[PDB]
Every structure is written in structure tokens, then in C-alpha cells.
A paper describes a structure:
The hydrophobic tunnel in CYP51Tb accommodates the antifungal drug posaconazole in either extended or bent conformations. The 2.6 Å structure of the CYP51Tb-posaconazole complex revealed four protein monomers in an asymmetric unit with posaconazole coordinating to the heme iron in a manner similar to that of fluconazole with the fluorinated edge of the 2,4-difluorophenyl ring facing away from the heme macrocycle, and the long substituent tail extending into the hydrophobic tunnel. In the CYP51Tb-posaconazole structure, four protein molecules in the asymmetric unit superimpose with the r.m.s.d. within of 0.5 Å, revealing virtually no conformational variations. However, posaconazole samples two distinct conformations due to the long tail swinging ∼7–8 Å in the hydrophobic mouth of the substrate binding tunnel. Three from the four monomers (chains A, B, and C) accommodate posaconazole in bent conformation while in the monomer D posaconazole is in extended conformation. Conformational variability of posaconazole is enabled by the interconversion of the piperazine six-membered ring between the chair and twisted boat conformations. The latter serves to accommodate the bend. Electron density is best defined in monomer B, where the terminal phenyl-2-hydroxypentan-triazolone group of posaconazole lies within 6 Å of protein residues I209-P210-A211 and V213-F214 which are invariant between CYP51Tc and CYP51Tb. In the extended conformation in monomer D, the phenyl-2-hydroxypentan-triazolone group swings toward residues I45-I46.,.The scattered Fo-Fc electron density map in the monomers A and D suggests possible interconversion of the posaconazole conformers in dynamic equilibrium, meaning that the phenyl-2-hydroxypentan-triazolone group dangles in space within the tunnel mouth.
Author numbering:
A (entry chain D): 30 to 254, 256 to 477
B (entry chain B): 30 to 252, 257 to 477
The structure:
Amino acid sequence: TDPPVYPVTVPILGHIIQFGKSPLGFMQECKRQLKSGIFTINIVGKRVTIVGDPHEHSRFFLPRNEVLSPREVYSFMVPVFGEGVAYAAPYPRMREQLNFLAEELTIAKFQNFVPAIQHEVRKFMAANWDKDEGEINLLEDCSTMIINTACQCLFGEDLRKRLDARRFAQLLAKMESSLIPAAVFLPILLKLPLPQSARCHEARTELQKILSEIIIARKAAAVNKSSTSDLLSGLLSAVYRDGTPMSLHEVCGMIVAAMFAGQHTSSITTTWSMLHLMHPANVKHLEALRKEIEEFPAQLNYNNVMDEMPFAERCARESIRRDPPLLMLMRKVMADVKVGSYVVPKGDIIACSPLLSHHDEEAFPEPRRWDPERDEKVEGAFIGFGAGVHKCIGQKFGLLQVKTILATAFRSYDFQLLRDEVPDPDYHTMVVGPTASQCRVKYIRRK
Amino acid sequence: TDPPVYPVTVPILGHIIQFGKSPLGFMQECKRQLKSGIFTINIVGKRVTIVGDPHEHSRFFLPRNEVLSPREVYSFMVPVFGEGVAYAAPYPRMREQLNFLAEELTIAKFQNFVPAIQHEVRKFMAANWDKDEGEINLLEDCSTMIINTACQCLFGEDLRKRLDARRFAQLLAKMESSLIPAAVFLPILLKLPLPQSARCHEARTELQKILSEIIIARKAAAVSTSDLLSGLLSAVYRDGTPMSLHEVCGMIVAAMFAGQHTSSITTTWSMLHLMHPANVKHLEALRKEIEEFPAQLNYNNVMDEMPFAERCARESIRRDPPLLMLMRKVMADVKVGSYVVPKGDIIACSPLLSHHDEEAFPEPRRWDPERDEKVEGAFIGFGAGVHKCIGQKFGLLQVKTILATAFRSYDFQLLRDEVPDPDYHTMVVGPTASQCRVKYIRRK
Ligand SMILES: CC[C@@H]([C@H](C)O)n1ncn(-c2ccc(N3CCN(c4ccc(OC[C@@H]5CO[C@@](Cn6cncn6)(c6ccc(F)cc6F)C5)cc4)CC3)cc2)c1=O
Ligand SMILES: CC[C@@H]([C@H](C)O)n1ncn(-c2ccc(N3CCN(c4ccc(OC[C@@H]5CO[C@@](Cn6cncn6)(c6ccc(F)cc6F)C5)cc4)CC3)cc2)c1=O
Ligand code: HEM
Ligand code: HEM
């Protein structure tokens, strides 16, 4: 009933090395060598059981927090969140907070988002992509466009007059760099007096100082009468099941969580999308994206992007499908849980790996081939946005952003990969994207 | 117009060594060799101007936050208050929060307290001081008594059905374990994971989970029973809005933290002085005062009708003040007598020092409850001015109920020649715990 452990060859470290050197190869190798889709690996002394069979995805995504907990495994994120916030808070309270954000990101809030986005893309374009052909780093540029377009959508004008996208990014970077992802396996690390923790602290107390100055100016305004909502006001008016409103630091915590969530996954999804579409091997697909946009006004609207872009959407999904930005979703097992024909014991870190599952040959024939036209051959094998009790809550907003960019970008430009092949993914980051140094691309305006 | 700085002779560290070795003696030595009550020391390179002349106290206490600020210096309190609460919030909002607590501790709320307190004290003595004679640590027992009474007064029955005094005391202890008082002088220490750093955060999230569950049960029955929690839940900031659970919680633990230590120390000192043979005269005085009351005390009895017990508690804080050194960051140049204290200095006024100026307090090391300040405003054991203590009433109400109930039924023998030495190594100073073994004798 215990799933097969893969033979340890390297004393205390376990497989931490041959994992990080090549996560996909190493997992595939495991799946084969143990003639089994469900297996256990060792990472610095900790048992990590991987649910690598797509037919078993529901055994990971559906059990409740009390059985499969995210708290313990995602605690290295307390820099982003703040100390008693998101996964660090009790489950009832965690749920309320994420629900408040979730309702702040529903399609019902997008009435004004497409123009917000389009404005910010064009403004980036007509300041950095403004020659008749130039050389840029595409990941970096998309990454900048996405932070700007996210702020424009979710921050009101009063907010952005004090805290523009450039300054939010800068603060966010300072907090982001405090993250030690190895802490999932070596929690001792979260106790080291590292100097990148002072920097994170300093940026958080600066973010809160500014938001507080904003809330005061908002309340002064509201007495002399009284209008226009955003992420902030929205959270600012959430009431918990108990009597009480959120505190500044929880409001702020959810804001930085929302923006960090979006910044990387969406950029990378955009970057990959465009790298794929620009590749000469996918002319047929580029052509299809162009036929899709062909009849659109210069100023797109809600319906253009939500309801009339199913081929750009497939492009995003497929990009995520082939090169998932989140490689391993994780939970600490709190009770023996059945999985396949196996029992996974209390104390195991249990993972489900979009990387591994999205390259299952039954589920996704020719996995390294990018093919928007495709569909999963096994039910619920695509888990790029997760599933279950912790489904991505920003999926729609993310894709709204990827699509609108693809739309605006390709309308006005072509691109040339300065390279024979699409970039190698770079697994050495917390959120995975194409290799930065390989993402230089020549833009070309359009006659 | 600068105050005179004491010669530095240990580079980097400054005077920290020679201050921590003897806070009082070092300070008086400066006060002497510069022939000045106002002077400047150096603590790990940070300027500290002590206002050590009781005549000039008001130049520390009266100015408002915007000139002499407590925020930067009392930041290190975050583990107790929570992020962005009390000393961590913007001035107005802090002021407001502390006014909400103030209103929860005024004399009006004390209607029920005395037979609650006295029930907890008696309950304690009937279980632990239960033989004709026995040995106990008096500091530990006073601490337990103070935690048990403060909870009985400030927490409803329903709250205490989830959290007894034992369990609250633990969680308070886990929060205080993350306090790093040296952070007054090394703020980096507030921005760093240290190994104790997580402890307060686990306790806090526990407490808040409990308060939330209690509140929900409180609102499920709401379709008497007023307490601290319901007080704060009903508070409305000067703008439209209420407190978050996080602030409410912060103010609750701030309150119990403040009261737990200072009151326990005050009681223990008081009982220690009163039990010493050299103070027999004063013990008889306290008994003549107590002898005139019923067995069952009331609000008026201990508040308005016990001026000698109150004198004993005050003279204890006078001799061995629990808070040695009160501080503010100087935000704008301030004149202090003759002398300008420059912007960016830490300005401090020390109750230890002032209560030992001979002009204000002759024979300062003698405990004499009969004495009075000979300089107006010299006693600052409870602070003064914009930040004067708001829990003083409640603190002394507990101390005095304990003194009356304790000496009515018991005598005590100090297992030692002398009143204990104060131990200056804790953040809220009390007598040395190991010197506090005492023998209780049940009377007639
Ligand atoms: C010397 C040896 C050396 C080499 C081997 O030589 N070496 N030494 C050490 N390592 C090493 C180092 C690190 C690792 N990683 C461990 C960390 N893992 C990881 C990744 C992502 C995670 O994300 C968690 C949440 C889920 O969703 C997000 C994101 N999101 C959702 N929507 C949009 N974004 C989310 C949720 C909610 C929110 F509100 C917000 C959010 F963002 C974040 C969690 C864990 C990857 C592997 C492995 C090995 C080595 O390689
Ligand atoms: C080397 C290993 C390390 C670790 C720790 O082992 N370590 N080892 C030793 N030291 C160490 C120890 C001490 C010092 N000094 C001692 C003098 N200082 C000091 C400053 C401010 C204080 O009080 C601030 C407020 C004022 O009022 C209170 C209290 N209150 C009001 N009413 C009733 N109580 C208040 C107010 C409002 C509320 F709502 C609540 C409250 F409580 C709290 C008190 C003392 C710090 C510097 C330096 C270093 C270490 O750091
Ligand atoms: C567009 C690319 C995105 C991808 C590929 C993505 C991916 C994911 C995945 C795989 C999960 C599962 C987490 C787990 O099981 O541990 C997740 C959850 C989550 N995502 Fe996303 N996400 C994206 C965009 C966004 C955006 C824009 C937001 C906006 C804030 C967001 C916020 C969240 C949150 C808060 C959760 C966790 C909710 C919970 O624990 O219930 N994501 N996302
Ligand atoms: C014998 C018992 C007590 C003593 C000896 C004492 C002493 C003091 C002192 C010296 C200050 C001045 C702080 C400064 O100037 O920096 C102060 C302030 C304060 N005390 Fe106490 N105190 C006692 C009891 C309490 C209790 C029981 C509470 C709450 C229940 C309390 C709450 C406060 C608060 C909230 C402040 C200052 C807030 C502000 O900055 O305005 N005290 N106390």
C-alpha cells in the first residue's frame, strides 16, 4: 500500500540535486523506472509523494484542508502575505480572505478592464517599441506590461497618483526577493537573519504607510460627497463572519498576494504565447490568431476578448499546458489518504505536478509539441490553474490580460525569434518561465 | 546649548556595559561628574539624553507626540500589540486606540470588580496557602493571583470557558518571548527572523481564532455580560469605522501585559516591605486600616477608604519603579531647562533616577509609606502628561485588594535578612525571583 520510493543514491540530500538539475526528466525517469504513476521521492529527508497519474488528480485536488493542508508547505510566503494572512491564518479565516479577493476578481468586475489594459499596452509600445524594427527582451517587456495593466485595472486613480506601477513593482520586487522557496523542505531557513528580510519588511511598512494615507484622503473626500470602486475599497468593505472588518495589514497582504500571483504567471503565459506564435513552425497558428482579430476595432471591448477570442485562449491554455508556470502544487498530508491503489501516510508532503502530468503520453500525445488545436485525452489532466478546493481564483483576469495583449500586440507587430528554437524553460525560479537570456526578439511595426 | 556628554571609553558599544552593570549608580555618577541633572549618554552609538532633574520633568511629559514621539522607541512592542497597532499606527489612530482602552479602565466599569478579585485571591489562598505554615515563592504567587484576577474582571464567562487564566498566561508568555528590548538601540533586530521570532505569531493567531469563535457565538445568541472585548467591539473611530479583530486583540493583550507585570511586582514589593521586621510599625498601620472593614470588601472600601495601603503601593513603586526608563524620540529641537536637546536624540526620563534624587526623596533606599515628594512632580512611577498611565486605577485596585485580603488572614516571614535586591535584567523590573521565598503563617 506504500507507494514505491525511488532508490536514494546520495546520502542526506536525497534526490534534491537530480530533481533541480532536470525536474521533467527526473520525474519521467521515476514514473518509468518504478513502472508506476504514483511514487515517493526524498528531498532533504522529507518524503514527497507525487500523484503523477492524471486519472488520480482528484485524490489531491478535492480532499479538504483539514486532510490535505496548504498551510505548512506554503509558509515561506509569509513575506508576500504578512504573518497571520492567507495560508498562515486558520482555515475558516483563510477561506474568507481568499473569497473576498476572489469576488474582487470576477468577470462581473471587468466592465472597464479591456480599455484599461489596452491603454497601458499601447503606452508601453509607443515608448519602447517605437522604431520600425528593434531588439527587446520579450519576457522582461511582457512582465512590465502585465504589472502596469494589472495596476491600471485594480488600482483607482487616487491610488495610482501616489503609487504608480513602476513604484509598486519596485516594492513588490523588494518583498519577492525575501522569498526562500527551499524553506518548504528546510524550514530552519525561515529562522536565518538574512538581510533580504529587512528589505522586505521595509517595503511592506512603506506600502502600508502609503495605503493608509490614501484611505484617509478617501474618507476626507467621502464626507464632502462619494463614487468609483477598486480592489482596495472592495476589500476595505469586506466584513468577516464575525462582526469585523479586515485590518490594513490583511488588506495589504491580499493586495500584494493578488499582484504577485498575477505578475509572473500571466507574463510568462504571454511570453510563451508570443514566442510560440512567432515561431515559423506555427505560421498556420499565427494566421489563425490574425483571422480571429482581423475584424476588430482599434479599441477592443469586453465581448471581443471574453466571448470572441477562443483561439487566443487556446493559445494561452496550451502555452501553460506545455510549460506550466507552477511546476508543483503541494500539501502536507494530515491523515492517511488513499491514492490509486496506495496509502499515503500522515506526514508526507504530497504533490501534483502540472509539469509531469501535462507530459503524460496517454493524456497529451507529443507533449513537447505546442498545439493550440489540441485537447486533453484524459479527463482533468490539464491542471495549469489547479483544480478543487484551491482552484486559481484569478484565471479569468489573467487570461483577459494575456488575450488583450496578444490581440493588441499582433495587430500592430510581427516578431522574429533570434534563435532557431523556442526558448528552453528555466526551472531555477519559483515561478517558471522561458529562459530570460534566450528571449531577445526583434519587433517589426506594420505597413 | 548642548547637554554635556559623558566621556565615552568603549568604542562601538559606548556606555551599554557600564549602564547594564549598574543602571542607578552609573546614572548618578554622570549626574555628579557633569554637575547637571540633564546629560547625554551613548548606547551602541545612539545618543540618549536623560532628563535627570526632577525640576525639569515637565519638559519630557507635556509636549505632544509630534515634538517628542513614542513610536520609534516603543516599536519593539510589536510582538504584544500586533502589526500597525498602538505605537505602530499613525499618531491620530494610536491616540484613538489608547483612548478606547482608557475608557475601558475608568472607575465606572469597576462596579463588580472587588468581589471578583477577592474571590480569585481567596480561591488562590485556599488551595495554595492552605496549611498553618508553608513556604512559597511570593513573586510567582502574586503573579498567578494577578493573572487570575485580571481575567476574572476583564473577560466574560464565555471567553473564560475557552481560555482560563492558565491558558491566557501561556499565550501571553509566548508573545513576550519574542520581545527584544535592545531593539530600541538596534532596530535592525525588528526586521530579522531570530529563532524566537515566530512564537508570538503562533500565539496571536490562536488567540484571534478563539476571539472570533467567541464573537460568532455571542452574535448567534444576541437575536449584563458587558466586558473588555464587547467594549472594544463597540468602539467607533472618529472616522466612520470599527476596530478589526486584530486591533481589538492587540489592545486586550497590551492591557493584560501592562497590568500583569507592574501590578505583580507592586504587590510583591509591598508585601515584602510590610513583612520585614524593620517595618512592623507600618504593618500595624495597615491592620488598623484593614481591621475596620467587613470580610466582603467593595468598590468604595479599597478605592476611597484605604489611603495607607495606597501609600504602601506607591512608595514601593517609588523605591523600585517597575519601568526604569521612559523614552521618546525627539522629532524637533526641544529646550530642557537651559540646554537644547537636538533633533534625533532619544530623550529619556528615568523613574529610577528621579525617585533617588535626595532633594525630592531623602534616604531614597528607605521604604517609608508615610513620606511625600519634597519636589512637586518628582514621583513618576505612573508617568505623566500626554502619556500618563491609564491603568493605574485598575492596577492599584488589584494590588490593594490583595494586600488587604492577604494580611487580614496571614502573616509572612522573609526567609532572608533583607528585602530582596531588584533585578534589573528584565524589561519590567521586579525583585529577584529567587530571593522571594517566603513563609506564610495563618493567623489565629
Ligand atoms: C544545491 C542544491 C540546489 C540545486 C539542486 O543544485 N537547490 N537547492 C534548493 N533547490 C530548490 C529550491 C526550490 C525548489 N522549489 C521549492 C518551491 N517550489 C514551489 C514553487 C511554487 C510554489 O507556489 C506556491 C503558491 C501556489 O500558487 C501561488 C502562485 N500563484 C497562483 N496563482 C498565480 N500565482 C499563489 C497562491 C496564492 C496566492 F495568494 C499567491 C500566490 F502566488 C504560490 C510553491 C513551491 C518549487 C520547487 C526546489 C529545489 C535547489 O534546486
Ligand atoms: C541580549 C538578549 C536579549 C533578549 C531579550 O534576551 N536582551 N537581554 C536583555 N535585553 C535588554 C533588556 C532591557 C533593555 N532596556 C530596558 C529599558 N527598556 C525599556 C523600554 C521600554 C519599556 O516600556 C515601553 C512601554 C511603556 O509602557 C508600557 C509598559 N506599561 C505601561 N503600563 C504598565 N506597563 C506599555 C504602554 C502601553 C501599553 F498599552 C502597554 C504597555 F506595556 C510599555 C520598558 C523597558 C528597553 C531597553 C535593553 C536590553 C535584551 O534585549
Ligand atoms: C494566468 C496565469 C495563472 C496561472 C497559470 C495560475 C495558476 C494557479 C494554480 C496552478 C493554482 C493552484 C494552487 C495550488 O493548488 O497550490 C492557483 C491558485 C491561485 N491563484 Fe492562480 N494562476 C494564474 C493567475 C492568477 C491571477 C491573476 C491571480 C490574481 C490574484 C491568481 C491568484 C491565485 C490565488 C489567490 C490561488 C489560490 C487560491 C486557494 O488556495 O484557494 N492566479 N493559480
Ligand atoms: C502598578 C501598575 C502600573 C504601573 C507601575 C504603570 C506605570 C506606567 C508608566 C510609568 C507609564 C508611562 C509610559 C511612558 O511614559 O513611556 C504608563 C503608561 C501606560 N500604562 Fe501603565 N502602569 C501600571 C499599570 C497599568 C495597567 C494595569 C495598564 C492597563 C491595564 C496600564 C496601561 C498603560 C498604558 C496603555 C500607558 C501609556 C499609553 C500612552 O502612551 O498614552 N498601566 N504606565
